[PDB]
Amino acid sequence: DRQIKIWFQNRRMKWKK
């Protein structure tokens, strides 16, 4: 259930918030 983050974090490394 880790892909739940990278799913949108993979391109939001800086826009995580």
PDB file of C-alpha atoms in Angstrom:
ATOM      1  CA  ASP A   1       0.000   0.000   0.000  1.00  0.00           C
ATOM      2  CA  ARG A   2       3.009   2.254  -0.576  1.00  0.00           C
ATOM      3  CA  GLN A   3       2.159   2.999  -4.208  1.00  0.00           C
ATOM      4  CA  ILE A   4      -0.731   5.037  -2.811  1.00  0.00           C
ATOM      5  CA  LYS A   5       1.771   7.867  -2.357  1.00  0.00           C
ATOM      6  CA  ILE A   6       4.120   7.594  -5.335  1.00  0.00           C
ATOM      7  CA  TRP A   7       0.935   7.438  -7.409  1.00  0.00           C
ATOM      8  CA  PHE A   8       0.841  11.237  -7.227  1.00  0.00           C
ATOM      9  CA  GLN A   9       4.084  11.841  -5.335  1.00  0.00           C
ATOM     10  CA  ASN A  10       6.214  10.429  -8.153  1.00  0.00           C
ATOM     11  CA  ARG A  11       5.731  13.807  -9.833  1.00  0.00           C
ATOM     12  CA  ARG A  12       4.977  15.851  -6.715  1.00  0.00           C
ATOM     13  CA  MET A  13       8.336  15.377  -4.994  1.00  0.00           C
ATOM     14  CA  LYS A  14       8.137  19.086  -4.174  1.00  0.00           C
ATOM     15  CA  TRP A  15       4.367  19.537  -4.402  1.00  0.00           C
ATOM     16  CA  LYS A  16       3.738  16.822  -1.814  1.00  0.00           C
ATOM     17  CA  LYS A  17       1.726  19.387   0.147  1.00  0.00           C
TER      18      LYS A  17
END
